[PDB]
Every structure is written in structure tokens, then in C-alpha cells.
């Protein structure tokens, strides 16, 4: 019958490992590096664009940084198409919660639900897992500023500073070296740019190869504001930090 061509995506190895999960994590380790850093007064999302050309339109481009909610945003590492499938369902779940309780969905509940969908493809279905790793930056009135990460296994953890994609071992060592608990967002913006510039496989870190986002509660407002940095805004902050 059809049994002959079955790869068996949801089976254990003799060691107790999940083949497709391990190989999907190997796929992500080649994708552009995404870094999230939590500060006392906000969260910083930074991402390095993989493969760029002179004729690539950057102003309309969005491949790694996505807006799920007015308070929650994500950094993408892996397959862009596979990410958008999960991103769309996450946006629906956020709106389902708001329709049910008349309140914005707490960050963890959205993260857990997406991780459970990723888990589903690991245990049943016979389908390949999503080759995507997310970094969740969000705010709710319970835990305040939160930073999560999720991978093809369906496992999620909280972080003060985390990196996904290429050169994670090098990036995590640099972050663990220069991070402090009383950091400001402006300091966290600088750290993210310094860590990426040192882990870059390319020659120099320019604005056309970067995506930047901050989630801050503006002191002159009292509400949480998301700011996806424009090509010019990334170009400005690149000069101020001392990279040019």
C-alpha cells in the first residue's frame, strides 16, 4: 500500500529522541539570528535578515518581526511560510480570548497555545513539524514585561535575554556577559546591536540587513506601545550606538 513511503515523522529514536524535531532545530540553526532582551522599562526585539540584495525592497519587507497583538510581538527564526501559518492562528486565539473575557490575553496563555499546536505535530498526524523558532515579547497586567521562546518540540521557556537561529552559542555567551538586571531599554537596544554585529556571518552589520522593534510603556501616556523600527530609524540607531 502506502506504508512503503511513510517516513514516520512522529517516532522515538533508540536514544529517546525525536528525529524530525532534532532535524527541524538543525534547519533553524542556519536561519538569521533573532535576539530578544528584556529591560526594566520595556523589551527589545532585534533580527538579522538572511540573504539580501540591492534590489530587495526593504520598506515593504517583513520576514522576522510580526505583530500578534497590540501588546504581544514575535521574532521569527526558520521557515517564513511555516511561521505565518502559526502567526495567523495566534492572532485568532488572541481575538477569541478578547471576545470571551473582554480582556487582552495574558502573554503565557498565547505562548502555551502555540506551543501545544507545535506539540501536536510531534505526537500525531504523520506530518512534518513546523521548522520555526519564536521569541515572544509581550506585556500583561499580571507579570509585566515577558520574554518567551518556543521551538519545533513544543517547549517554551521564559528569558531575560535570548537568541534563536544561527550562532546561538556565541550570542548567548555575549549576552550572559554584558546583561544586568537593572538595564534600561536604550542599553538593551545597544546590547542587541553589539551581539548581532559580533555573531554576523557577513562582513558588516548595516541597516538594510536588520529588523528592530521595541515594546515600551510610554511615561507620557500610561499605555503599552509597540514600535516596529523603519529602515531610517534602524539607520539612525546604528550610527548612535557606534557602528555607523
Amino acid at each position: 500500500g502506502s506504508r512503503r513511503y511513510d517516513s514516520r515523522t512522529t517516532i522515538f529514536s533508540p536514544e529517546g529522541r525525536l528525529y524530525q524535531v532534532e532535524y527541524a532545530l538543525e534547519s533553524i540553526s542556519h536561519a538569521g539570528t533573532a535576539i530578544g532582551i528584556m529591560a526594566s522599562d520595556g523589551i527589545v526585539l532585534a533580527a538579522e535578515r538572511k540573504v539580501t540584495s540591492t534590489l530587495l525592497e526593504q520598506d515593504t519587507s517583513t520576514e522576522k518581526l510580526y505583530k500578534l497583538n497590540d501588546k504581544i510581538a514575535v521574532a521569527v527564526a526558520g521557515l517564513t511560510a511555516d511561521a505565518e501559518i502559526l502567526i495567523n492562528t495566534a492572532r485568532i486565539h488572541a481575538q477569541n480570548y478578547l471576545k470571551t473575557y473582554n480582556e487582552d490575553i495574558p502573554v503565557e496563555i498565547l505562548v502555551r497555545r502555540l506551543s501545544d499546536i507545535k506539540q501536536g505535530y510531534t505526537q500525531h498526524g504523520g506530518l512534518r513539524p513546523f521548522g520555526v523558532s519564536f521569541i515572544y515579547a509581550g506585556y500583561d497586567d499580571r507579570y509585566g514585561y515577558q520574554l518567551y521562546t518556543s521551538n519545533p518540540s513544543g517547549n517554551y521557556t521564559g528569558w531575560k535575554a535570548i537568541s534563536v537561529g544561527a550562532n546561538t552559542s556565541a550570542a548567548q555567551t555575549l549576552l550572559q556577559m554584558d546583561y544586568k538586571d537593572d538595564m534600561k531599554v536604550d542599553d538593551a537596544i545597544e546590547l542587541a546591536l553589539k551581539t548581532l554585529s559580533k555573531t554576523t556571518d557577513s562582513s558588516a552589520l548595516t541597516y538594510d540587513r536588520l529588523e528592530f522593534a521595541t515594546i515600551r510603556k510610554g511615561a507620557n501616556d500610561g499605555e503599552v506601545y509597540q514600535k516596529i523600527f523603519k529602515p531610517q530609524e534602524i539607520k539612525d540607531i546604528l550610527v548612535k550606538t557606534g557602528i555607523t
Binding site: 505583530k67 492572532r91 485568532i92 481575538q95 478578547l98 471576545k99 473582554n102
Partner: protein, 204 residues
């Protein structure tokens, strides 16, 4: 028996010179018994305003539905919805429930952000678009509102003058209806600012 006469309430919209106005009463009732004097019937999603009359459970449901839909719209389009586009969204959403309809009379009011053109629209319970240039009325005192608007209305009224027109059209129509009144609220919508005013009226 009639689901459009259990709770009561009225909504009226009017266009002016570079401005639109939408007004509603605050009464929530159960037949003859008055229950609440705070039930607002006008909602907004970005710069587009929507006033809903009829069965209150459906008024709340549709508001939660259109908040749900405009939020997902804003995330995909990367822009706020326009009054013309939202009108079509309401129309298609109501007709989706053709043989099990929401007992409502929705009213869309707003100004297009790109053209600066004033826009108002009305619907029946199954989604037929009534796009009039002058005024749109809905509710238990729709007959009274039609008579007030047809007489008082004149084209190209200034924001300050349009307020007086819509407020007097709402107040006098509500006083001839047993299921309407118990306070009122008027929205004055411009390209840059929107003013919300609570009206002083009879409480009987």
C-alpha cells in the same frame, strides 16, 4: 414577541460640512420595566463608528464580533478600516445569518481618512445597505426620527450647528416613544477630533 421591541432604543446619524454626527439614547429595558440608563449603543473601531439598535444581546454580540474582525483586519492590512469597507463587512456578516438573523438595526458613521469625505450607512436585520447622503435612523422610534430629520435637516451644517440639529431630532423623537429615552449621547466626528456630549433630557 417582537425581538426589536423588548429592550427599546434609538440611533440617528447625520452628515454636515466636513463632519458626521451619530447619536443614541441610553435606555435598556425589559418590556415596560426600565432596567439600565447607561446602555450605550454607539461603538467605534479606529475612526469608524457603529450604532446598533434592537435586541441588546445581539447589540453586545455584534460589537464583540466587529471588534474581533477589525482587529484582525488591522494586523493583516497594516491600516485602520474605512467607513465604506466596514459597511460592506457589516452587510456580509449579517447576510451570513440570513435564516437566523441578529435582530438589529446597525448604523455606520465616519469620515474617510484619505479623501476626507463624510460617510453614513444603514442596514436592516439581514444586511441590506441604505446609503443616504443626509440622515440614517434606526430603533423603536424610527418613525418619529424620520419625521424630525426630514424637517430639521439642511445640507452643509457646521459641527456646532449639526450638533443642535441631531440633538433636537433625537430628544423630541425619544419623548414620543415609551421604550426610548433615559439619557442620550451625541458624537461629533471630524477629520482630526471627535467630541462626546451627554444630553440632559426627560427621565420618564
Amino acid at each position: 414577541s417582537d425581538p426589536s421591541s423588548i429592550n427599546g432604543g434609538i440611533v440617528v446619524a447625520m452628515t454636515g460640512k466636513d463632519c458626521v454626527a451619530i447619536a443614541c439614547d441610553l435606555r435598556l429595558g425589559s418590556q415596560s420595566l426600565g432596567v439600565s440608563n447607561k446602555f450605550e449603543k454607539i461603538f467605534h473601531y479606529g475612526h469608524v463608528f457603529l450604532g446598533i439598535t434592537g435586541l441588546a444581546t445581539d447589540v453586545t454580540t455584534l460589537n464583540e464580533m466587529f471588534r474581533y474582525k477589525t482587529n484582525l483586519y488591522k494586523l493583516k492590512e497594516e491600516r485602520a478600516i474605512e467607513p465604506e469597507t466596514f459597511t460592506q463587512l457589516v452587510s456580509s456578516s449579517l447576510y451570513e445569518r440570513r435564516f437566523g438573523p441578529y435582530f438589529v438595526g446597525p448604523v455606520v458613521a465616519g469620515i474617510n481618512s484619505k479623501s476626507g469625505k463624510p460617510f453614513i450607512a444603514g442596514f436592516d436585520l439581514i444586511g441590506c445597505i441604505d446609503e443616504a447622503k443626509d440622515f440614517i435612523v434606526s430603533g423603536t422610534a424610527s418613525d418619529q426620527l424620520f419625521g424630525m430629520c426630514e424637517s430639521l435637516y439642511e445640507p452643509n451644517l457646521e459641527p456646532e450647528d449639526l450638533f443642535e440639529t441631531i440633538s433636537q431630532a433625537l430628544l423630541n423623537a425619544a419623548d414620543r416613544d415609551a421604550l426610548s429615552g433615559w439619557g442620550a449621547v451625541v458624537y461629533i466626528i471630524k477629520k482630526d477630533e471627535v467630541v462626546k456630549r451627554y444630553l440632559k433630557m426627560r427621565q420618564d
